[PDB]
Amino acid sequence: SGPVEVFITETPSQPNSHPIQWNAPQPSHISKYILRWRPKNSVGRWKEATIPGHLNSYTIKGLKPGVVYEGQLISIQQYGHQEVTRFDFTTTSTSTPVTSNTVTGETTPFSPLVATSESVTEITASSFVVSWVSASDTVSGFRVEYELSEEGDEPQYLDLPSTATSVNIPDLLPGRKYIVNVYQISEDGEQSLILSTSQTT
């Protein structure tokens, strides 16, 4: 038939989650609804899902911040005809420091320390173990976000199943304060703050 109807709503911008919605004809012309998407970066492998004919909205989790994903909506008929629709969207955490771009000029900022040693080290221990309560059984998964309460570096997100009620955050910088916020993702892709706390490695 002809392309299905899809649009973005109540979606100002999410970090790891991204909810979508679609509409179909009035008559029982379409039965099953299938949604497939992939991060505008490759045409090899991607994700797909099936949505009952009674549902008109999906939920996408495990997305990467500052990245764009292309989605397609396919409507199948009782072992009859088939239709495919294509759409695309972007995913952002929101606003963050240093996000803006710097400008080159005659100014020469200071450069502490000279060159780099032959050998360098990464991050060790300083991990964190935070647990919360699935303040909701309708949660489809959980999303943890932690960032430096000082430097303000870029925020990181971790996705866990609706059955997860605790997670360990590794690769933490010792002697640094981090802000942790746990959000639960509903079947609609909505996030709700259930636990917010800071810690000092």
Structural domains present in the chain: 1-93 (2.60.40.10), 125-201 (2.60.40.10)
Residue identified by tokens 């990245």 is: 67
Long-range CB contact pairs, 82-85, < 8 A, 24+? 83/1, 83/2, 83/3, 83/4, 83/30, 84/3, 85/3, 85/4, 85/5, 85/6, 85/22
Token duo for residue 10: 């109540």
Beta strands at 47-51 and 82-91: parallel, antiparallel or unpaired: unpaired
Q: What is residue 92's three-state secondary structure?
A: coil
Residue 39 bridge partners (DSSP): 69
To the nearest 10°, report the CA torsion of 9, 11, 16, 19: -10
User: Residue 88: which residues within 8 A CB-CB, separation 6 or more?
Assistant: 40, 68, 69, 70, 71
Q: What is residue 19's three-state secondary structure?
A: strand
Terminus-to-terminus CA distance in the chain, angstroms? Answer: 58
DSSP 124-152: -S--EEEE---S-TTEEEEEEEEEETTT-
- Distances from the Cα of 109 to the Cαs of 91, 101, 112, 153, in angstroms? 33, 15, 10, 20
Longest dimension (CA), the chain: 71
